[PDB]
Amino acid sequence: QVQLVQSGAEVKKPGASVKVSCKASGYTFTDYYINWVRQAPGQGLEWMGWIHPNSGGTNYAQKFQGWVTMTRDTSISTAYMELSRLRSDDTAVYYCARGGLYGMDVWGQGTTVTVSGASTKGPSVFPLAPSSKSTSGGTAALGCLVKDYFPEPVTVSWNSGALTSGVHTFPAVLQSSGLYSLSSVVTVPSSSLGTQTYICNVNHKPSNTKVDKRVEPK
Amino acid sequence: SVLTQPPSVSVAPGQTARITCGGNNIGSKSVHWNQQKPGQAPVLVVYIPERFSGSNSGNTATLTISRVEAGDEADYYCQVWDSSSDHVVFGGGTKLTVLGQPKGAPSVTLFPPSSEELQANKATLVCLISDFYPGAVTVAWKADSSPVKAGVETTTPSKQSNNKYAASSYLSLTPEQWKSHRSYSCQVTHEGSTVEKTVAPT
């Protein structure tokens, strides 16, 4: 099993630096080149450079010369890459593809680097009450508004994970203020309201915040 | 070296898709093809079924996929090795779309501001759009039949788990703005047809 496992997501500020590691498995780390590739959100693939783990020499594309530094630790079969003085453009997913000593086979799962001036902020959770208009043919639609948080992600469960059917959680909007907002709606039978309790469980680990909002009818 | 690809290609299920990669004497420089599905890392093909075959000659390289499935919807990148610089050069990428999926009209649910948010001197209108194909929507907002564009945040369409698309549009406004108008409306149009939901402070 040949694998490349990279470090977790990183959320940095403009002017900050970041280091991302790439763990190699299932093959001798030192007879295959290690390449790095950057993919901006919605753009194509962009080769950044390579490094050969035997002699540690590097080769950078001109665009990334000066602020990208690639190293490696042959002991733990890990490659590293350091982005310095980050910009909003550098927001992208960064991969660590393996290259032949002619393969260019096997990629890592990628690391997300989000550069932004927004500050870590927990969300304000508001219930989206059912009532009329939310009801359509005996089924009611109750929701939970998860407003003004940074950075991604949040997780929304219902009734501590006991309510899974009819759950539709929507991908978050990135407002112009730099904060995120999403909504999570459930469709329940209109006869269930009054006898059943509905609570949305919003977990936002980056801010160490978890909010259980009871959603009651009007 | 530069690598030029068509930005998008579309094919019916079971048909044959062809993705080209143009370059300076690419026919003698060994071409590799990558496949990237949304949210995942690229996966090398370069020929995973035998429906994928390669053909490099002259100034164009061509990846050919026979009997296309919906599972083949992905982004495809050609890749060559510029021996002038010991660099790896990628193509622009081609979006393969399969034209067999069933069309669908958008389902829209609009929520007024919560009382709790109004007690915080804030107000947000939540428009939730779901179960539409193809994934392209335009959202418009109205305050008593007068168009409104300030405070509008809309997501780009994102594919759901049922292989349809979903979006959401939010209208930010003040409590005195929300209670000053008779009603507000979220209008969603999709392939000419429009669905509208209205909500009022009463």
Author numbering:
A (entry chain H): 1 to 101, 111 to 227
B (entry chain L): 2 to 48, 57 to 211
What do the authors say?
The affinity-matured CH65 has 18 mutations throughout the light (VL) and heavy (VH) variable regions, which improve affinity to strains that circulated early in the donor’s life and confer affinity to antigenically drifted strains. This work showed that CH65 primarily matures by preconfiguring the HCDR3 loop into its binding conformation, thereby minimizing the conformational entropic cost of binding. Importantly, none of the 18 somatic mutations are in the HCDR3; rather, key mutations in HCDR1, HCDR2, and LCDR1 result in contacts that stabilize the HCDR3 loop in its binding-compatible conformation.
Similarly, although the I-2 with the mutations Y35N and H35N confer affinity to SI06, the HCDR3 lacked sufficient density and also had high B factors (bottom middle). In examining the minimally mutated variants that can bind SI06, we find that Y35N in the light chain and H35N in the heavy chain interact synergistically with the I-2 mutations (G31D, M34I, N52H) to confer affinity to SI06 (bottom). Similarly, H35N removes a methionine–aromatic interaction, known to have a stabilizing effect in proteins, between the HFWR2 and HCDR3. However, the addition of H35N into the I-2 background produced weak but detectable affinity with an association rate that was improved upon addition of Y35N.
